[PDB]
Amino acid sequence: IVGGYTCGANTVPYQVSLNSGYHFCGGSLINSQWVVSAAHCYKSGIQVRLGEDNINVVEGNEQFISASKSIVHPSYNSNTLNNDIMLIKLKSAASLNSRVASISLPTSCASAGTQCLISGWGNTKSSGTSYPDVLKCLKAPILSDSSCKSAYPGQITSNMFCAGYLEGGKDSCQGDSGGPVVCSGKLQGIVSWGSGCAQKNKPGVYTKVCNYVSWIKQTIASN
Ligand SMILES: NC[C@H]1CC[C@H](C(=O)O)CC1
Numbered sequence: 362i363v364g365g366y367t368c369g370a371n372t373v374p375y376q377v378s379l380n381s382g383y384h385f386c387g388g389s390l391i392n393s394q395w396v397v398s399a400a401h402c403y404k405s406g407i408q409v410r411l412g413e414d415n416i417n418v419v420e421g422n423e424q425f426i427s428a429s430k431s432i433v434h435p436s437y438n439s440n441t442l443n444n445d446i447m448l449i450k451l452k453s454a455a456s457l458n459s460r461v462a463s464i465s466l467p468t469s470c471a472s473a474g475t476q477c478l479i480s481g482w483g484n485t486k487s488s489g490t491s492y493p494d495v496l497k498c499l500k501a502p503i504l505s506d507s508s509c510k511s512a513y514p515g516q517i518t519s520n521m522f523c524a525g526y527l528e529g530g531k532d533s534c535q536g537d538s539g540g541p542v543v544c545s546g547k548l549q550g551i552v553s554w555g556s557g558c559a560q561k562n563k564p565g566v567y568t569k570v571c572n573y574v575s576w577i578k579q580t581i582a583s584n
Pocket residue numbers: 532533534535536537538552553554555556557558559564565566
């Protein structure tokens with residue numbers, strides 16, 4: 362997260378870290394057994410880390426649970442990142458508490474201009490590299506579809522939206538992939554892709570979760 366702030370320990374209790382020897386992506390807990398992340402975060406051997414603040418220090422509220430299965434969206438296209446969504450099942454149910462909590466799925470899509478919270482352990486520098494260790498947060502609005510498509514002509518599908526600031530300075534960044542965009546208490550986005558971080562006219566692009574709620578619910582119910 363570039364241009365954000367330190368969330369505060371466990372203030373985003375649905376935020377998870379995906380770990381394969383090291384943190385490599387975010388995700389969002391949607392019930393005690395299931396996490397939603399980006400399909401481009403897929404790999405084998407994932408451990409889901411819940412209740413994290415400092416990802417380099419055991420602080421006492423963590424739960425580390427291996428994934429038993431991953432399900433990439435059937436229509437995911439790795440070249441264009443269309444349908445950049447994946448479900449991860451936990452081998453044992455998380456113990457839900459005030460610091461480890463699920464986020465509700467959308468009942469409808471959110472409007473342009475709605476303010477959202479984006480969070481993650483990614484790079485905090487728009488030029489160069491610095492990783493923060495504690496969870497960073499950013500308040501950012503959903504941008505109009507026309508401004509999104511103007512920023513990335515030929516690349517935005519109906520399964521994507523932009524959020525952030527066309528003037529730059531505040532954005533998601535490397536290592537935030539797969540993490541949440543929450544608006545009005547619902548998981549509306551997944552950190553998906555962009556061009557650089559916090560550059561003018563290059564906002565972050567997010568998977569449009571509201572298009573996937575039926576697939577999420579049916580997939581969880583059958584797996
Ligand atoms: N600034 C958006 C940001 C989205 C994730 C991406 C990635 O890490 O794959 C990097 C760019």
